[PDB]
Amino acid sequence: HWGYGKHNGPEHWHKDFPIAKGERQSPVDIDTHTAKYDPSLKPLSVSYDQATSLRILNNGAAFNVEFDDSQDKAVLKGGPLDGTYRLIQFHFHWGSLDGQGSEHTVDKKKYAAELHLVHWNTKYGDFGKAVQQPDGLAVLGIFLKVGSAKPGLQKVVDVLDSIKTKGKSADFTNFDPRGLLPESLDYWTYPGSLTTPPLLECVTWIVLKEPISVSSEQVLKFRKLNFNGEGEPEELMVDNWRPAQPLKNRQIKASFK
Ligand SMILES: [Zn+2]
């Protein structure tokens, strides 16, 4: 099955998922000089104060922190978006080394990791319906660089010991995702896809310009997770990122000058 090894990694995915070679695949390199400021873009509205986190899961590709998405408790609106998008989960992609790990790049620069807050368009009623629509999902992407610790990340880091292997989960209530944001909400946006199979072309990407800083110790703990299940040969969960894909017939817009 698909993964991030030499034998089943991103360069192989097209055989099972031909949309991998589609017209709006993600991630992409963000060429900052080519993106254009769009004065018609609105500020992002990130309304997370009523978010209800539930659980943290190792799914064999990353770990997801899942939220109650049965009501409009944590929603993304504004920016390039038409309508209301509910937070369902967040997860990260990261590297084996601090100089790689992000999926998007900025003028070809790779960050140590990238956080994805995944939201679905409530007009489609459920996530499974939303992913079948060109405007079904909105993903907020945030780069991580290594420097000072991110205080609001530590609760996530500290629970990882308990979800080491694929299939493990733990309670993860009362977590506030506002603690994972940078100061500025300036962003780039473009139409794209899921970055894991099934690679569906259903995402409005909103990638924040300002990275968050996390400490070396925080990211080192991500790298102790396992892709494998319990009792199987250990394969460290590292380099779980898809490389940049061709931009094709797309323009990246900036919310800032
Ligand atoms: Zn992701």
Curated annotation (Swiss-Prot):
Consequence the record notes for mutating N59T: Reduced activity
EC numbers, comma separated: 4.2.1.1, 4.2.1.69
Biological process (GO), any one: angiotensin-activated signaling pathway
Outcome of substituting V118 to A/G/I/L/S: Reduced CO(2) hydrase and p-nitrophenyl acetate esterase activities
EC category name: lyase
Outcome of swapping T195 to A/C/H/P: Strongly reduced activity
Free-text comment on the cofactor: Zinc. Can also use cobalt(II) with lower efficiency, but not copper(II), nickel(II) and manganese(II).
Effect of N59L: Reduced activity
Gene3D superfamilies per record: Alpha carbonic anhydrase
pH dependence: Optimum pH is 6-8.
Catalytic reaction list: hydrogencarbonate + H(+) = CO2 + H2O; urea = cyanamide + H2O
Consequence of substituting V139H: Impaired activity
Site feature (Fine-tunes the proton-transfer properties of H-64) residues: Y4, N59, N64
Effect of N59A: Reduced activity
Residue numbers bearing the Phosphoserine modification: S162, S169
InterPro entries: CA_dom, CA_dom_sf, Carbonic_anhydrase_a-class, Carbonic_anhydrase_a-class_CS
Ligand binding (substrate): T195, T196
Binding site for Zn(2+): H91, H93, H116
Site residues by UniProt (Involved in the binding of some activators, including histamine and L-histidine): Q89
CDD domains (UniProt xref): alpha_CA_I_II_III_XIII
Key words, A-Z: Acetylation, Cell membrane, Cytoplasm, Disease variant, Lyase, Membrane, Metal-binding, Osteopetrosis, Phosphoprotein, Zinc
Gene Ontology CC terms: apical part of cell; cytoplasm; cytosol; extracellular exosome; myelin sheath; plasma membrane
Outcome following mutation: T195 to D/E: Strongly reduced activity, but enhanced zinc affinity
The protein's assembly and partners: Interacts with SLC4A4. Interaction with SLC4A7 regulates SLC4A7 transporter activity. Interacts with SLC26A6 isoform 4 (via C-terminus cytoplasmic domain).
More about this protein: Target of drugs used in treatments against glaucoma disorder and breast cancer.
Full protein name: Carbonic anhydrase 2
The organism of origin for this protein: Homo sapiens
Gene: CA2
